[PDB]
Amino acid sequence: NLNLFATILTYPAPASNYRGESEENRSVIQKILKDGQKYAIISPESMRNALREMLIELGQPNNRTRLHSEDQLAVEFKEYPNPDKFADDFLFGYMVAQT
RNA sequence: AGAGCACUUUUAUCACCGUGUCCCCAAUCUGGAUAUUUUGUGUG
Numbered sequence: 001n002l003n004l005f006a007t008i009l010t011y012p013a014p015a016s017n018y019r020g021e022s023e024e025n026r027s028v029i030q031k032i033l034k035d036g037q038k039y040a041i042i043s044p045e046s047m048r049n050a051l052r053e054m055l056i057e058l059g060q061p062n063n064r065t066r067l068h069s070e071d072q073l074a075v076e077f078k079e080y081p082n083p084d085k086f087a088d089d090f091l092f093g094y095m096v097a098q099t
Numbered sequence: 100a101g102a103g104c105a106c107u108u109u110u111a112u113c114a115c116c117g118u119g120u121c122c123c124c125a126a127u128c129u130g131g132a133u134a135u136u137u138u139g140u141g142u143g
Contacts, residue, residue: 020108
């Protein structure tokens with residue numbers, strides 16, 4: 001009847017993530033004015049994608065894959081998620097369609 | 100269970116290439132630490 005939550009930390013190392021929206025001849029990273037300084041930010045979406053990739057890597061069945069399409073990246077290999085089992089890892093079975 | 104917050108910042112790339120801080124020069128010239136001083140006093 002409790003909902004425990006944690007907080008992690010990472011070892012120091014040079015940063016790699018680039019946030020696009022390149023200006024002139026440099027690729028930049030979004031910053032926040034926490035106290036008038038600059039900081040690095042990683043959006044929760046990429047972390048969610050990494051978690052889903054790890055779940056599909058460990059053998060847990062799922063119904064969503066983003067493959068390297070020739071034209072532009074897209075998400076496919078899905079069906080009706082009528083059972084929450086074997087689909088969506090009990091998370092975010094989003095749908096907006098009317099039919 | 101908050102005007103339902105997902106599906107995307109993604110995939111590659113040597114600042115590279117050659118180059119004597121080099122060539123001469125004296126720290127040189129003189130100068131008495133000098134002047135005096137009893138380890139003296141007695142024991143089978």
